[PDB]
């Protein structure tokens, strides 16, 4: 329960503190030569930070939507080898890939083979989404250092550091979700395989 609740808490505090930050940036977008130069650089930094934060937010939101649909998959046809096999029997792979990968005489062994294939494909989809998330995060995260180097009072800095800590927390939580999907698939594959060997043991006798 801590998982779901903690994810929602992390999300909320991230969104609120992010909106606060954007407000404070806005505020400076509103309100000697070296003075002009410095203030202009502060503005440029603000623009860059705004972009960076925008990308981070878009990535988090993509991940959460994905978690929704992916949770739907793991509650239906990926919750048991039973349902995986039933799903594959109703929705078989293309005849091409079928005979390329699982050209087997035994039609039960064919289902098991297609089941493993399907698991591998979902695995691949998830690793791909995770890699995209990690890349967006790593590419854009350090963009928050402006928020500290341009801080003035120790308090203001502290609050910015906390903000960043919250971003890192939320990314950590999302990562945990991705990795657990893959683990659940690993376990599913082992039960599927053990089920197959139980089938062979019962069949020979």
Automatic annotation (TrEMBL):
Keyword annotations of the record: Coiled coil
Organism this protein belongs to: Helicobacter pylori (strain ATCC 700392 / 26695)
Modified residues (N6,N6-dimethyllysine): 8, 23, 43-44, 57, 75, 89, 107, 116, 118, 123, 135, 159, 161, 165, 169, 176, 196
A Pfam family: CagL
Any coiled-coil regions, as ranges: 178-205
Keyword Coiled coil: yes
Protein name in UniProt: Cag pathogenicity island protein (Cag18)
Coiled coil found in the keyword field: yes
Disulphide bond pairs: 102-113
Ranges that cross the membrane: none
